[PDB]
Amino acid sequence: KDVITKDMNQLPLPARNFINSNFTKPQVAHIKIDKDMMESTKYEVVLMDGTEIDFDSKGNWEEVSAKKGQTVPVSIVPGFAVNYLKAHNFVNEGVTKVERDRKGYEIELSTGLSFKFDKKGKFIKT
């Protein structure tokens, strides 16, 4: 059965720690708790500042997405991607989405420019 809650304490500890460490004065707008098609629990957290954070059943972040006109905390941006943005002079664009999964990583900028990388942080030639 799906659940909507406003209680941060329903999240696994690693998920609460991630929010606490990376966001300024975070407060829950709402959290949806459901399952994927393999019967694994999923958490979709939306903060009052508009940011969405999706977590797996163990509390590992899968995606952080900022609201239009906002950007994600630089602290969540993986090192290799910070390095890439600096190497290509994109430090001042703002990152609006960071995603990770079995294929690697995706980073989106405020402009809509986006980049995918493999699990070792290498840009995927496509």
Side-chain angles (χ1 to χ4, degrees), residues 81-105:
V82 169
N83 289 352
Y84 184 92
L85 297 174
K86 177 171 176 173
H88 293 291
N89 295 317
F90 289 137
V91 181
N92 295 132
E93 309 299 304
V95 173
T96 53
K97 196 178 68 182
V98 179
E99 195 181 345
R100 63 189 182 158
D101 72 8
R102 66 192 179 79
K103 300 187 178 172
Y105 298 88

Side-chain angles (χ1 to χ4, degrees), residues 11-12 14 35 39-43 55-60 62:
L11 295 172
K35 284 175 173 302
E39 292 303 295
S40 187
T41 303
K42 296 284 178 196
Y43 302 90
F55 298 98
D56 77 6
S57 66
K58 294 177 173 185
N60 301 303
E62 299 161 313

Side-chain angles (χ1 to χ4, degrees), residues 11 19 26 28 34 91:
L11 295 172
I19 295 164
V28 171
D34 65 352
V91 181

Side-chain angles (χ1 to χ4, degrees), residues 4-5 8-9 14 20 34 46 48 62 70-71 80 83 93 106 110 114 119 121:
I4 304 299
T5 181
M8 185 84 76
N9 278 320
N20 180 266
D34 65 352
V46 183
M48 288 292 277
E62 299 161 313
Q70 292 286 101
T71 60
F80 79 83
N83 289 352
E93 309 299 304
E106 179 173 342
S110 299
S114 76
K119 292 185 286 178

